[PDB]
Amino acid sequence: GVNAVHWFRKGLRLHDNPALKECIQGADTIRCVYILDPNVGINRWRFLLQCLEDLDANLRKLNSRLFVIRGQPADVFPRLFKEWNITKLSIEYDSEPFGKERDAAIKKLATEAGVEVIVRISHTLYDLDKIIELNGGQPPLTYKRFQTLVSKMEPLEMPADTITSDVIGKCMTPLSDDHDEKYGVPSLEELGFDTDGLSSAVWPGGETEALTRLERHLERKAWVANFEMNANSLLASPTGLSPYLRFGCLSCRLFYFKLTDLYKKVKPPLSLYGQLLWREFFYTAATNNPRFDKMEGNPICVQIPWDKNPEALAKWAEGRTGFPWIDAIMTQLRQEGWIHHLARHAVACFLTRGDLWISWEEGMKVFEELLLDADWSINAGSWMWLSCSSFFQQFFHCYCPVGFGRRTDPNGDYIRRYLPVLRGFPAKYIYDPWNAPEGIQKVAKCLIGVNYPKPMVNHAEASRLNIERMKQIYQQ
Ligand SMILES: N#Cc1cccc(Cl)c1NC(=O)Cn1c2ccccc2c2ccccc21
Numbered sequence: 001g002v003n004a005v006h007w008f009r010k011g012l013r014l015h016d017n018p019a020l021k022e023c024i025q026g027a028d029t030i031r032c033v034y035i036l037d038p039n040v041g042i043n044r045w046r047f048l049l050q051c052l053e054d055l056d057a058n059l060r061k062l063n064s065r066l067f068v069i070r071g072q073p074a075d076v077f078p079r080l081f082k083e084w085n086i087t088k089l090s091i092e093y094d095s096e097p098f099g100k101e102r103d104a105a106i107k108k109l110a111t112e113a114g115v116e117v118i119v120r121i122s123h124t125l126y127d128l129d130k131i132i133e134l135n136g137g138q139p140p141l142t143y144k145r146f147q148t149l150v151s152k153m154e155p156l157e158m159p160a161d162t163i164t165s166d167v168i169g170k171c172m173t174p175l176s177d178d179h180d181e182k183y184g185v186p187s188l189e190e191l192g193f194d195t196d197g198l199s200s201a202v203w204p205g206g207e208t209e210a211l212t213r214l215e216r217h218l219e220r221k222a223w224v225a226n227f228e229m230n231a232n233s234l235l236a237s238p239t240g241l242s243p244y245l246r247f248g249c250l251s252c253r254l255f256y257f258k259l260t261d262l263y264k265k266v267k268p269p270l271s272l273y274g275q276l277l278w279r280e281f282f283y284t285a286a287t288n289n290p291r292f293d294k295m296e297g298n299p300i301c302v303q304i305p306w307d308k309n310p311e312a313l314a315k316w317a318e319g320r321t322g323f324p325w326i327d328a329i330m331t332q333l334r335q336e337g338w339i340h341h342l343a344r345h346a347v348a349c350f351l352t353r354g355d356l357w358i359s360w361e362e363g364m365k366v367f368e369e370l371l372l373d374a375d376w377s378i379n380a381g382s383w384m385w386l387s388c389s390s391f392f393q394q395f396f397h398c399y400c401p402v403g404f405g406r407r408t409d410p411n412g413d414y415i416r417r418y419l420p421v422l423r424g425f426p427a428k429y430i431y432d433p434w435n436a437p438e439g440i441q442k443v444a445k446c447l448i449g450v451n452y453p454k455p456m457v458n459h460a461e462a463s464r465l466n467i468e469r470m471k472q473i474y475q476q
Helices: 018-024 042-060 073-083 097-112 128-134 143-150 207-224 242-247 252-266 270-286 310-317 324-336 341-354 360-370 376-386 403-408 413-418 438-443 459-473
Strands: 003-008 029-036 066-070 088-092 116-120
Touching (some): 018 088, 029 073, 042 207, 073 097, 088 097, 097 116, 128 143, 128 270, 207 242, 270 376, 310 324, 310 360, 324 360, 341 360, 403 413
Parallel strands (some): 003 088
Protein backbone atom coordinates (compact mmCIF):
# COMPACT_ATOMS: atom_id res chain seq x y z
CA GLY A 1 0.00 0.00 0.00
CA VAL A 2 1.66 3.17 -1.28
CA ASN A 3 0.05 6.55 -0.57
CA ALA A 4 1.89 9.48 -2.14
CA VAL A 5 1.90 13.28 -1.88
CA HIS A 6 3.49 15.64 -4.39
CA TRP A 7 4.22 19.08 -2.94
CA PHE A 8 4.03 21.95 -5.46
CA ARG A 9 6.11 25.07 -4.74
CA LYS A 10 7.75 26.03 -7.98
CA GLY A 11 7.33 23.62 -10.89
CA LEU A 12 3.62 24.53 -11.20
CA ARG A 13 3.02 22.33 -14.25
CA LEU A 14 2.16 18.82 -15.40
CA HIS A 15 4.73 18.78 -18.22
CA ASP A 16 8.39 17.93 -17.49
CA ASN A 17 7.80 17.17 -13.79
CA PRO A 18 10.13 14.27 -12.98
CA ALA A 19 9.36 14.43 -9.23
CA LEU A 20 5.59 14.11 -9.76
CA LYS A 21 6.07 11.46 -12.44
CA GLU A 22 8.32 9.36 -10.20
CA CYS A 23 5.99 9.74 -7.21
CA ILE A 24 3.07 8.39 -9.25
CA GLN A 25 4.72 5.11 -10.34
CA GLY A 26 3.83 2.18 -8.10
CA ALA A 27 1.54 4.34 -5.95
CA ASP A 28 -2.02 3.42 -5.05
CA THR A 29 -3.18 6.99 -4.28
CA ILE A 30 -1.75 10.45 -5.00
CA ARG A 31 -2.60 13.95 -3.83
CA CYS A 32 -0.93 17.12 -5.13
CA VAL A 33 -0.69 19.86 -2.50
CA TYR A 34 0.18 23.53 -2.50
CA ILE A 35 0.81 25.14 0.87
CA LEU A 36 0.15 28.84 1.42
CA ASP A 37 -0.60 30.84 4.57
CA PRO A 38 -3.15 33.74 4.43
CA ASN A 39 6.87 41.40 0.80
CA VAL A 40 4.66 40.37 -2.15
CA GLY A 41 2.46 42.78 -4.13
CA ILE A 42 -0.93 42.18 -5.70
CA ASN A 43 0.42 41.34 -9.18
CA ARG A 44 2.63 38.51 -7.86
CA TRP A 45 -0.19 37.07 -5.74
CA ARG A 46 -2.63 37.27 -8.66
CA PHE A 47 -0.17 35.44 -10.90
CA LEU A 48 0.31 32.69 -8.30
CA LEU A 49 -3.43 32.22 -7.77
CA GLN A 50 -4.01 32.01 -11.54
CA CYS A 51 -1.25 29.34 -11.73
CA LEU A 52 -2.96 27.33 -9.00
CA GLU A 53 -6.35 27.72 -10.72
CA ASP A 54 -4.83 26.39 -13.94
CA LEU A 55 -3.18 23.44 -12.12
CA ASP A 56 -6.48 22.53 -10.43
CA ALA A 57 -8.29 22.72 -13.79
CA ASN A 58 -5.71 20.47 -15.46
CA LEU A 59 -5.73 18.00 -12.57
CA ARG A 60 -9.54 17.92 -12.84
CA LYS A 61 -9.16 16.63 -16.41
CA LEU A 62 -7.28 13.68 -14.84
CA ASN A 63 -10.02 12.87 -12.26
CA SER A 64 -7.85 14.54 -9.58
CA ARG A 65 -7.69 17.90 -7.77
CA LEU A 66 -5.19 20.38 -6.42
CA PHE A 67 -5.22 20.49 -2.60
CA VAL A 68 -4.47 24.01 -1.30
CA ILE A 69 -3.68 23.89 2.42
CA ARG A 70 -3.58 27.11 4.43
CA GLY A 71 -0.73 27.15 6.95
CA GLN A 72 3.00 26.50 7.42
CA PRO A 73 4.57 23.28 6.07
CA ALA A 74 6.15 22.22 9.38
CA ASP A 75 2.82 22.83 11.16
CA VAL A 76 0.51 21.02 8.68
CA PHE A 77 2.48 18.05 7.27
CA PRO A 78 2.89 15.86 10.44
CA ARG A 79 -0.86 15.37 10.85
CA LEU A 80 -1.35 15.16 7.06
CA PHE A 81 1.12 12.27 6.86
CA LYS A 82 -0.85 10.57 9.59
CA GLU A 83 -4.38 11.19 8.27
CA TRP A 84 -3.63 10.08 4.72
CA ASN A 85 -1.27 7.20 5.71
CA ILE A 86 1.42 8.78 3.52
CA THR A 87 4.50 6.76 2.60
CA LYS A 88 6.07 8.89 -0.18
CA LEU A 89 6.55 12.65 -0.53
CA SER A 90 7.98 14.17 -3.73
CA ILE A 91 9.36 17.65 -4.39
CA GLU A 92 11.11 19.49 -7.15
CA TYR A 93 14.51 20.48 -5.76
CA ASP A 94 15.00 24.09 -4.56
CA SER A 95 18.62 25.29 -4.76
CA GLU A 96 17.91 28.58 -2.98
CA PRO A 97 19.28 28.72 0.60
CA PHE A 98 16.01 29.50 2.43
CA GLY A 99 14.18 26.76 0.52
CA LYS A 100 17.00 24.32 1.29
CA GLU A 101 16.55 25.10 4.98
CA ARG A 102 12.77 24.64 4.79
CA ASP A 103 13.16 21.38 2.84
CA ALA A 104 15.71 19.93 5.26
CA ALA A 105 13.27 20.56 8.13
CA ILE A 106 10.46 18.77 6.27
CA LYS A 107 12.76 15.88 5.37
CA LYS A 108 13.41 15.23 9.08
CA LEU A 109 9.67 15.35 9.77
CA ALA A 110 9.19 12.91 6.89
CA THR A 111 11.84 10.51 8.18
CA GLU A 112 10.32 10.52 11.67
CA ALA A 113 6.97 9.49 10.16
CA GLY A 114 8.48 6.78 7.96
CA VAL A 115 7.90 8.78 4.75
CA GLU A 116 10.29 8.36 1.83
CA VAL A 117 11.24 11.68 0.20
CA ILE A 118 11.82 11.87 -3.55
CA VAL A 119 13.70 14.94 -4.79
CA ARG A 120 14.33 15.63 -8.47
CA ILE A 121 15.86 18.56 -10.32
CA SER A 122 13.64 20.35 -12.80
CA HIS A 123 13.87 24.08 -12.07
CA THR A 124 17.35 24.33 -13.63
CA LEU A 125 18.99 22.77 -16.67
CA TYR A 126 21.92 21.53 -14.61
CA ASP A 127 22.74 19.87 -11.30
CA LEU A 128 24.22 23.00 -9.73
CA ASP A 129 26.06 21.11 -6.96
CA LYS A 130 27.98 19.17 -9.62
CA ILE A 131 29.08 22.47 -11.21
CA ILE A 132 30.34 23.65 -7.82
CA GLU A 133 32.14 20.34 -7.22
CA LEU A 134 33.80 20.67 -10.63
CA ASN A 135 34.99 24.15 -9.58
CA GLY A 136 36.59 22.89 -6.34
CA GLY A 137 33.72 23.64 -3.96
CA GLN A 138 32.99 27.28 -4.85
CA PRO A 139 30.61 28.65 -7.52
CA PRO A 140 32.12 30.47 -10.50
CA LEU A 141 31.77 34.24 -10.37
CA THR A 142 32.29 34.72 -14.15
CA TYR A 143 30.08 33.66 -17.01
CA LYS A 144 32.96 32.32 -19.11
CA ARG A 145 34.12 30.04 -16.28
CA PHE A 146 30.55 28.82 -15.85
CA GLN A 147 30.42 27.93 -19.58
CA THR A 148 33.73 26.03 -19.33
CA LEU A 149 32.49 23.98 -16.37
CA VAL A 150 29.15 23.27 -18.03
CA SER A 151 31.01 21.99 -21.12
CA LYS A 152 32.45 19.26 -18.88
CA MET A 153 29.04 18.13 -17.65
CA GLU A 154 27.21 15.12 -18.99
CA PRO A 155 24.82 16.05 -21.83
CA LEU A 156 21.61 17.55 -20.56
CA GLU A 157 18.60 15.63 -19.33
CA MET A 158 15.69 15.51 -21.76
CA PRO A 159 12.31 16.68 -20.37
CA ALA A 160 10.11 14.14 -18.62
CA ASP A 161 6.80 12.94 -20.05
CA THR A 162 3.72 15.02 -19.24
CA ILE A 163 1.39 13.63 -16.59
CA THR A 164 -1.59 12.05 -18.38
CA SER A 165 -4.33 9.56 -17.60
CA ASP A 166 -2.00 6.91 -19.06
CA VAL A 167 0.76 7.88 -16.63
CA ILE A 168 -1.67 7.94 -13.70
CA GLY A 169 -2.99 4.49 -14.67
CA LYS A 170 -4.67 2.70 -11.76
CA CYS A 171 -3.45 5.28 -9.22
CA MET A 172 -6.22 7.58 -8.03
CA THR A 173 -7.01 10.59 -5.85
CA PRO A 174 -9.49 10.17 -2.98
CA LEU A 175 -11.77 13.21 -2.94
CA SER A 176 -13.96 14.38 -0.06
CA ASP A 177 -17.34 16.06 -0.48
CA ASP A 178 -15.97 19.19 1.26
CA HIS A 179 -12.94 19.42 -1.06
CA ASP A 180 -13.84 22.75 -2.64
CA GLU A 181 -14.32 24.52 0.69
CA LYS A 182 -11.51 22.96 2.74
CA TYR A 183 -8.82 22.71 0.02
CA GLY A 184 -9.93 25.26 -2.57
CA VAL A 185 -7.77 27.85 -4.28
CA PRO A 186 -7.92 31.22 -2.46
CA SER A 187 -9.23 34.50 -3.86
CA LEU A 188 -7.35 37.81 -3.82
CA GLU A 189 -10.00 39.20 -1.47
CA GLU A 190 -9.46 36.29 0.93
CA LEU A 191 -5.79 37.27 1.07
CA GLY A 192 -6.79 40.81 2.12
CA PHE A 193 -6.45 42.58 -1.25
CA ASP A 194 -8.83 45.30 -2.38
CA THR A 195 -9.63 44.40 -6.00
CA ASP A 196 -11.74 47.54 -6.57
CA GLY A 197 -9.56 49.21 -9.20
CA LEU A 198 -8.17 46.05 -10.80
CA SER A 199 -7.84 45.76 -14.56
CA SER A 200 -7.23 42.31 -15.98
CA ALA A 201 -3.69 41.02 -15.92
CA VAL A 202 -1.13 41.90 -18.57
CA TRP A 203 0.55 38.62 -17.59
CA PRO A 204 -1.98 35.80 -17.03
CA GLY A 205 -0.47 33.05 -14.91
CA GLY A 206 -0.46 29.30 -15.52
CA GLU A 207 0.97 26.37 -17.49
CA THR A 208 -1.75 26.62 -20.14
CA GLU A 209 -0.86 30.23 -20.94
CA ALA A 210 2.86 29.38 -20.74
CA LEU A 211 2.67 26.59 -23.33
CA THR A 212 0.55 28.69 -25.72
CA ARG A 213 3.08 31.53 -25.47
CA LEU A 214 5.96 29.06 -25.94
CA GLU A 215 4.56 27.93 -29.30
CA ARG A 216 3.97 31.48 -30.52
CA HIS A 217 7.40 32.48 -29.15
CA LEU A 218 9.12 29.87 -31.35
CA GLU A 219 7.14 30.81 -34.47
CA ARG A 220 8.17 34.43 -33.94
CA LYS A 221 11.84 33.47 -33.42
CA ALA A 222 12.06 31.51 -36.67
CA TRP A 223 9.53 33.29 -38.89
CA VAL A 224 9.82 36.97 -37.87
CA ALA A 225 13.00 37.63 -35.88
CA ASN A 226 15.09 34.99 -37.72
CA PHE A 227 17.04 34.22 -34.52
CA GLU A 228 18.31 37.79 -34.08
CA MET A 229 15.27 47.74 -26.57
CA ASN A 230 13.35 50.14 -28.83
CA ALA A 231 10.05 51.90 -28.23
CA ASN A 232 8.18 48.68 -29.06
CA SER A 233 10.35 46.42 -26.86
CA LEU A 234 9.50 48.44 -23.71
CA LEU A 235 5.87 47.24 -23.83
CA ALA A 236 4.89 43.76 -22.65
CA SER A 237 5.09 41.13 -25.37
CA PRO A 238 2.39 38.50 -25.90
CA THR A 239 5.16 35.91 -26.31
CA GLY A 240 7.22 36.90 -23.25
CA LEU A 241 8.07 33.86 -21.14
CA SER A 242 10.01 35.10 -18.15
CA PRO A 243 7.30 35.11 -15.42
CA TYR A 244 6.39 31.55 -16.48
CA LEU A 245 10.02 30.44 -16.13
CA ARG A 246 10.22 31.99 -12.65
CA PHE A 247 7.02 30.38 -11.35
CA GLY A 248 7.70 27.10 -13.13
CA CYS A 249 4.65 27.20 -15.41
CA LEU A 250 7.20 26.55 -18.17
CA SER A 251 10.04 24.05 -17.91
CA CYS A 252 13.45 25.56 -18.71
CA ARG A 253 14.49 22.19 -20.16
CA LEU A 254 11.46 21.98 -22.47
CA PHE A 255 12.22 25.50 -23.69
CA TYR A 256 15.88 24.58 -24.30
CA PHE A 257 14.98 21.44 -26.28
CA LYS A 258 12.36 23.31 -28.34
CA LEU A 259 14.90 26.02 -29.19
CA THR A 260 17.55 23.51 -30.29
CA ASP A 261 15.05 21.53 -32.35
CA LEU A 262 13.67 24.68 -33.99
CA TYR A 263 17.16 25.87 -34.95
CA LYS A 264 18.16 22.45 -36.31
CA LYS A 265 15.12 22.20 -38.59
CA VAL A 266 15.14 25.80 -39.81
CA LYS A 267 18.90 26.20 -40.19
CA PRO A 268 23.63 26.49 -32.66
CA PRO A 269 25.35 29.54 -31.13
CA LEU A 270 25.30 30.23 -27.40
CA SER A 271 23.30 33.40 -28.09
CA LEU A 272 20.36 31.07 -28.81
CA TYR A 273 20.28 30.11 -25.09
CA GLY A 274 21.95 33.20 -23.62
CA GLN A 275 19.04 34.00 -21.29
CA LEU A 276 18.70 30.45 -19.90
CA LEU A 277 22.36 30.08 -18.96
CA TRP A 278 22.44 33.39 -17.06
CA ARG A 279 19.55 31.90 -15.05
CA GLU A 280 21.68 28.90 -14.09
CA PHE A 281 24.67 31.16 -13.38
CA PHE A 282 22.95 33.13 -10.61
CA TYR A 283 21.26 30.08 -9.07
CA THR A 284 24.67 28.41 -8.91
CA ALA A 285 26.26 31.51 -7.34
CA ALA A 286 23.48 31.78 -4.76
CA THR A 287 22.90 28.20 -3.65
CA ASN A 288 25.60 27.91 -0.93
CA ASN A 289 25.41 31.56 0.21
CA PRO A 290 22.65 32.28 2.78
CA ARG A 291 23.58 35.99 2.80
CA PHE A 292 23.57 36.28 -1.03
CA ASP A 293 20.94 39.05 -0.80
CA LYS A 294 22.97 41.12 1.73
CA MET A 295 26.07 43.27 1.73
CA GLU A 296 27.35 42.53 5.25
CA GLY A 297 28.35 38.95 5.95
CA ASN A 298 28.26 38.22 2.18
CA PRO A 299 31.77 37.01 1.20
CA ILE A 300 31.31 37.78 -2.52
CA CYS A 301 30.00 41.33 -2.01
CA VAL A 302 32.25 44.40 -1.97
CA GLN A 303 31.53 46.52 1.12
CA ILE A 304 30.45 49.95 -0.13
CA PRO A 305 29.39 52.90 2.11
CA TRP A 306 25.86 53.33 0.78
CA ASP A 307 23.70 56.07 2.28
CA LYS A 308 20.45 55.60 4.20
CA ASN A 309 17.82 57.92 2.79
CA PRO A 310 14.20 56.73 3.17
CA GLU A 311 12.90 59.90 1.50
CA ALA A 312 14.93 59.43 -1.68
CA LEU A 313 14.21 55.67 -1.65
CA ALA A 314 10.45 56.27 -1.44
CA LYS A 315 10.62 58.77 -4.33
CA TRP A 316 12.43 56.15 -6.42
CA ALA A 317 10.13 53.25 -5.52
CA GLU A 318 6.95 55.25 -6.17
CA GLY A 319 8.12 56.85 -9.41
CA ARG A 320 8.29 60.41 -8.07
CA THR A 321 11.93 61.20 -8.90
CA GLY A 322 11.16 64.02 -11.35
CA PHE A 323 13.08 62.20 -14.09
CA PRO A 324 10.34 61.03 -16.47
CA TRP A 325 12.32 58.04 -17.84
CA ILE A 326 12.91 56.64 -14.33
CA ASP A 327 9.38 57.47 -13.17
CA ALA A 328 7.70 55.84 -16.19
CA ILE A 329 9.73 52.66 -15.78
CA MET A 330 8.87 52.43 -12.08
CA THR A 331 5.20 53.15 -12.91
CA GLN A 332 4.95 50.34 -15.50
CA LEU A 333 6.65 48.06 -12.97
CA ARG A 334 4.10 48.75 -10.23
CA GLN A 335 1.12 48.61 -12.62
CA GLU A 336 1.98 45.53 -14.72
CA GLY A 337 4.78 43.58 -13.03
CA TRP A 338 7.32 43.47 -15.87
CA ILE A 339 9.82 45.96 -17.31
CA HIS A 340 12.47 45.43 -19.98
CA HIS A 341 15.86 44.14 -18.83
CA LEU A 342 17.56 47.35 -19.97
CA ALA A 343 14.99 49.47 -18.12
CA ARG A 344 15.93 47.50 -14.98
CA HIS A 345 19.57 48.51 -15.59
CA ALA A 346 18.53 52.16 -15.82
CA VAL A 347 16.52 52.34 -12.62
CA ALA A 348 19.02 50.17 -10.72
CA CYS A 349 21.96 52.36 -11.74
CA PHE A 350 19.98 55.46 -10.73
CA LEU A 351 19.18 54.14 -7.27
CA THR A 352 22.66 52.84 -6.46
CA ARG A 353 26.02 53.88 -7.97
CA GLY A 354 24.71 56.38 -10.50
CA ASP A 355 22.65 58.91 -8.57
CA LEU A 356 21.09 58.29 -5.15
CA TRP A 357 23.92 56.15 -3.61
CA ILE A 358 21.32 53.96 -1.91
CA SER A 359 22.19 50.33 -1.18
CA TRP A 360 21.31 47.73 -3.81
CA GLU A 361 19.59 45.76 -1.00
CA GLU A 362 16.77 48.31 -0.94
CA GLY A 363 16.14 48.22 -4.67
CA MET A 364 16.22 44.44 -4.57
CA LYS A 365 13.39 44.47 -2.01
CA VAL A 366 11.19 46.75 -4.16
CA PHE A 367 11.83 44.48 -7.16
CA GLU A 368 11.01 41.37 -5.07
CA GLU A 369 7.64 42.96 -4.23
CA LEU A 370 6.68 44.10 -7.75
CA LEU A 371 8.58 42.11 -10.45
CA LEU A 372 6.93 38.85 -11.57
CA ASP A 373 10.17 37.25 -12.87
CA ALA A 374 12.30 38.29 -9.87
CA ASP A 375 13.30 35.08 -8.23
CA TRP A 376 15.69 35.60 -5.35
CA SER A 377 18.93 34.37 -6.94
CA ILE A 378 18.70 36.36 -10.20
CA ASN A 379 17.32 39.48 -8.48
CA ALA A 380 20.04 39.67 -5.80
CA GLY A 381 22.67 38.73 -8.37
CA SER A 382 21.57 41.41 -10.84
CA TRP A 383 21.45 44.15 -8.17
CA MET A 384 25.01 43.35 -7.07
CA TRP A 385 26.09 43.34 -10.73
CA LEU A 386 24.47 46.71 -11.52
CA SER A 387 25.76 48.42 -8.34
CA CYS A 388 29.31 47.18 -9.11
CA SER A 389 29.21 45.12 -5.90
CA SER A 390 30.33 41.74 -7.26
CA PHE A 391 31.10 39.67 -10.37
CA PHE A 392 34.08 41.97 -10.95
CA GLN A 393 31.96 44.71 -12.43
CA GLN A 394 33.60 48.12 -12.77
CA PHE A 395 32.07 51.61 -12.78
CA PHE A 396 32.98 52.40 -16.39
CA HIS A 397 29.89 54.40 -17.33
CA CYS A 398 26.75 55.75 -15.71
CA TYR A 399 23.34 55.60 -17.41
CA CYS A 400 21.99 59.07 -18.13
CA PRO A 401 18.41 59.26 -16.76
CA VAL A 402 17.62 61.64 -19.66
CA GLY A 403 19.72 60.44 -22.58
CA PHE A 404 19.12 56.70 -22.29
CA GLY A 405 15.35 57.13 -22.38
CA ARG A 406 15.72 59.66 -25.19
CA ARG A 407 17.77 57.17 -27.22
CA THR A 408 15.42 54.21 -26.55
CA ASP A 409 12.20 56.11 -27.38
CA PRO A 410 13.11 59.40 -29.12
CA ASN A 411 9.45 60.43 -29.36
CA GLY A 412 8.70 59.90 -25.66
CA ASP A 413 5.52 57.92 -26.29
CA TYR A 414 6.60 55.62 -23.43
CA ILE A 415 6.60 58.65 -21.08
CA ARG A 416 3.20 59.87 -22.28
CA ARG A 417 1.82 56.34 -21.81
CA TYR A 418 2.83 55.80 -18.18
CA LEU A 419 2.94 59.43 -16.98
CA PRO A 420 -0.18 60.90 -18.65
CA VAL A 421 0.27 64.07 -16.60
CA LEU A 422 3.17 64.80 -19.02
CA ARG A 423 1.25 63.94 -22.21
CA GLY A 424 1.10 67.60 -23.34
CA PHE A 425 4.90 68.03 -23.51
CA PRO A 426 6.70 68.02 -26.88
CA ALA A 427 9.40 65.48 -27.60
CA LYS A 428 12.04 68.20 -27.22
CA TYR A 429 11.25 68.39 -23.51
CA ILE A 430 9.47 65.14 -22.62
CA TYR A 431 12.53 63.57 -20.92
CA ASP A 432 13.65 66.82 -19.21
CA PRO A 433 10.42 68.76 -18.59
CA TRP A 434 12.07 71.10 -16.07
CA ASN A 435 13.81 72.76 -19.04
CA ALA A 436 10.49 73.58 -20.73
CA PRO A 437 9.62 77.30 -20.72
CA GLU A 438 6.59 78.27 -18.67
CA GLY A 439 4.54 78.79 -21.84
CA ILE A 440 5.17 75.21 -22.97
CA GLN A 441 4.34 74.06 -19.43
CA LYS A 442 1.13 76.13 -19.65
CA VAL A 443 -0.03 74.53 -22.92
CA ALA A 444 0.88 71.11 -21.51
CA LYS A 445 -1.34 71.90 -18.50
CA CYS A 446 1.47 70.67 -16.23
CA LEU A 447 3.44 73.01 -13.96
CA ILE A 448 6.77 71.39 -13.12
CA GLY A 449 7.17 71.42 -9.36
CA VAL A 450 3.37 71.58 -8.95
CA ASN A 451 1.70 68.84 -11.03
CA TYR A 452 4.86 66.78 -11.61
CA PRO A 453 7.93 67.08 -9.37
CA LYS A 454 11.18 68.80 -10.18
CA PRO A 455 14.16 66.42 -10.53
CA MET A 456 15.28 65.17 -7.11
CA VAL A 457 19.02 65.43 -7.94
CA ASN A 458 21.34 67.17 -10.36
CA HIS A 459 22.47 64.15 -12.35
CA ALA A 460 25.66 65.61 -13.84
CA GLU A 461 26.97 66.48 -10.39
CA ALA A 462 25.61 63.51 -8.44
CA SER A 463 27.12 61.10 -10.97
CA ARG A 464 30.46 62.96 -10.95
CA LEU A 465 30.66 62.77 -7.15
CA ASN A 466 29.48 59.13 -7.09
CA ILE A 467 32.05 57.95 -9.64
CA GLU A 468 34.72 59.68 -7.55
CA ARG A 469 33.58 58.05 -4.30
CA MET A 470 33.50 54.59 -5.91
CA LYS A 471 36.99 55.08 -7.40
CA GLN A 472 38.56 55.88 -4.05
CA ILE A 473 37.23 52.73 -2.36
CA TYR A 474 39.91 50.94 -4.41
CA GLN A 475 43.66 51.46 -4.29
CA GLN A 476 44.38 53.86 -7.15
N1 LIG B 1 19.65 37.83 -17.01
C1 LIG B 1 20.56 38.43 -16.71
C2 LIG B 1 21.75 39.26 -16.29
C3 LIG B 1 23.04 38.84 -16.60
C4 LIG B 1 24.14 39.58 -16.22
C5 LIG B 1 23.95 40.76 -15.53
C6 LIG B 1 22.66 41.16 -15.21
CL1 LIG B 1 22.41 42.67 -14.33
C7 LIG B 1 21.56 40.42 -15.59
N2 LIG B 1 20.22 40.89 -15.23
C8 LIG B 1 19.47 41.65 -16.21
O1 LIG B 1 19.93 41.86 -17.29
C9 LIG B 1 18.07 42.16 -15.86
N3 LIG B 1 17.66 42.11 -14.45
C10 LIG B 1 17.94 43.07 -13.53
C11 LIG B 1 18.69 44.26 -13.63
C12 LIG B 1 18.83 45.09 -12.53
C13 LIG B 1 18.26 44.74 -11.30
C14 LIG B 1 17.53 43.55 -11.19
C15 LIG B 1 17.37 42.72 -12.33
C16 LIG B 1 16.70 41.45 -12.55
C17 LIG B 1 15.94 40.60 -11.71
C18 LIG B 1 15.39 39.42 -12.23
C19 LIG B 1 15.61 39.10 -13.57
C20 LIG B 1 16.35 39.93 -14.39
C21 LIG B 1 16.91 41.13 -13.87
